[PDB]
């Protein structure tokens, strides 16, 4: 049975013949949908997805350096040359740096210093922009106690479907996205197989080298000092140095932002919601009644409460009968045996005609002290049942 | 010749037979003091450093883990557990999930979780303490023009220092290092071979594994947490994730930070400042005098005008009855030679007796024009110079 696991389970009656019932779906919760002369039916969202979402930047947050070289002037003598110092590949510093007899020259002054270090990225982070028009909820349909199952796809644009359930006839769906953000204030960021969705604002102003989406041949980082300094420079010669990975203080700076998953080409996201209007006067009873069954029921698993004060059970049917109806009720008066509570997995039926055949139930049973009664006659199972406030 | 080159050049004028100055000792810096009936001398701080300096707290800023498990447990299946969960070398989690038929209990309820996996650093750093007692300033005292050349050490619990310069007598320091760097409210780090001055709170108060002074045993870091966390909980594991390096954090947050040097051994400092009075009593012209040199002198370095506005010449001497004093002096007018300006280079002597041998001089012009004049006689140096005034 599904959904008797799930913590996150809202309980949605219909009403009458009501056609129409809300629904909220949100991401691992589940829905049960019950409706007089209408078979139980479990909606769940599966997942929520983003496609096509397409590259703004990249920020390099690992970089080593290679070949650092210098050139220097005596005042007087022009400018330092280097011919890496135009190639935009290589970071460079230019600067003026006092000369004289003790280091090489004739005249006391400033002289000219160039210093360059091939710049290359170790690791990099990406940000991609996401539009609303590729958003995509995976949703699952069931008739619950089990094609008695269905898959619809939802997106913005195409908010109506509808779920075949076979012998059951069909629901309707008409949906509404409630993400609760703001596509267009968000990037999704992806750093070493991690992802989270981030403010524009943020992303835009981290001071790392980077450049814009991917790409044009071979890449060419802007800003390539955010991570690389140079060190006070003497006569002859700079040093230069590469500032350390940032990947953990990025992580730091992401302690709040929400968190996303890929799986696989697309962006998964983990939050949001989504509003449903379930249209049910096409969902029926399956056209066939059945006797009821006549042989004896036997717990395979016992009475255990769920979460949300339901009671599951698993029978073994001891009969050759099936097709048959299962006898399944809740009475406080074992003498009477006028119902009481309901059954959530509704109309139940033994399907197989050997012998020993299993199935679950699940029961709603009233508040205080009950009776589950499965079965007929003298070999019935009586089980007393309390249901407290927990 | 030392000190023309240095841009933070401090000159000071003795007095009388004054017997003392006070200078201001700086980090690449030199100070150039001249007096009447005095050798010019150069005093330089050259290093300052801290010796046995003693560790106190390493930072782990980048971890692996290994050999993840977990055990889970149905609720009234009692507590999880692992063979590692209070192993000090593991980080491990304890929580509760939700538990029912659909994973394998029989009843809906909090089932018992919990997951290890063992920590080890892949980089760490050190801080370590400083002691005033252990620091140790260099200084050399020179005679200028230049046993020409002292090194002497002041220490907070030796300020005095004396320095012996052959025969031009001798030289006493007197320093105030308190005047100084002052620690007690510092520590030296090292990262990755760089090295850093940072205060003792801030680094007290880094989010990061750590562990004491520093060990012999294995190491046992507190707070791994600080670079390991658990996502999620499932009904039977939880996944365990490193965060990344915190290199670059460590370094955005030393951006202010004093650096750095340690070769070798011992911390070497670079910010210096030293405040002291240099005793000039013993200090005396030689007691031998010399005859003016006779053969001729040539420019090997034509005149150039320092930072400061002196002027450095550096001349060839081809005679060979030296030791003797070099004719030098500035004169605006030719005929009579009376000197104007002074040299700083004071008391020029050729001191070897060979041939060919080279020489500089540092002269202080006065503004505009006037003549250097070097050796006497018809094959004298004569060198117009034009002083600007401008620096």
């Known amino acids: 049975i599904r959904c008797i ?29 019950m409706a007089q002369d209408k078979p139980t039916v479990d909606i769940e969202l599966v997942t929520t997805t983003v496609s096509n979402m397409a590259e703004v930047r990249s920020y390099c947050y690992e970089a080593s350096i290679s070949d650092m070289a210098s ?66 909820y995976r949703i699952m349909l069931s008739v619950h106690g089990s094609e008695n199952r269905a898959k619809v796809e939802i997106t913005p644009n ?10 059951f006839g069909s629901l309707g769906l008409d949906c509404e996205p409630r993400t609760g953000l703001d596509f267009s204030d968000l990037y999704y960021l992806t750093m070493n197989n ?28 802007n800003n390539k000092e955010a991570l690389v300094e140079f060190k006070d420079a003497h006569a002859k ?25 890929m799986d696989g080409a697309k962006g998964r996201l983990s939050s949001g919601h989504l509003k449903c209007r379930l249209k049910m006067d096409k969902l029926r009873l399956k056209g066939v009644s059945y006797s009821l069954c006549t042989a004896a029921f036997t717990f395979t698993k016992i009475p255990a409460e769920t979460l949300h004060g339901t009671v599951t059970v698993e ?17 406080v008066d074992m003498q009477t045996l006028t119902p009481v509570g309901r059954l959530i997995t509704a109309n139940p039926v033994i399907t197989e005609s050997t012998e020993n055949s299993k199935m679950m139930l699940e029961l709603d049973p009233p508040f205080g002290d009950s009776y589950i009664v499965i079965g007929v006659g003298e070999k019935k199972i009586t089980h007393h049942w309390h249901r407290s406030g927990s």
């Open 71 to 136: 050139d220097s002037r005596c005042p007087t003598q022009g400018e330092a040359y280097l011919d890496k110092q135009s190639d935009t590949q290589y970071v460079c510093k230019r600067t003026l740096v006092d000369r004289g007899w003790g280091n090489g020259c004739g005249l006391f002054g400033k002289g000219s210093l160039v210093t360059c270090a091939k710049f290359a990225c170790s690791k990099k982070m990406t940000g991609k922009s996401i539009q609303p028009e590729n958003l995509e």
């Open 194 to 221: 991690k992802h989270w969705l981030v403010h524009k604002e943020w992303f835009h102003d981290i001071p790392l080298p980077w450049h814009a989406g991917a790409d044009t041949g071979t890449p060419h980082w």
């Open 5 to 33: 696991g799930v913590s996150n389970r809202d309980f949605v009656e219909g009403m009458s013949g009501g056609t129409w019932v809300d629904v909220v779906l949100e991401h691992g919760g589940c829905v049960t949908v």
């Open 158 to 167: 195409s908010p109506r479907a509808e779920a075949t359930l076979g012998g």
């Open 237 to 261: 010669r700079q040093t230069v140095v590469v500032l350390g990975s940032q990947e953990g203080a990025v992580h730091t700076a992401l302690a709040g932002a929400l968190e996303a998953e």
């Open 315 to 331: 029978v073994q049917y001891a009969g050759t009968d099936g097709p048959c109806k299962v006898p399944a009720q809740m009475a």
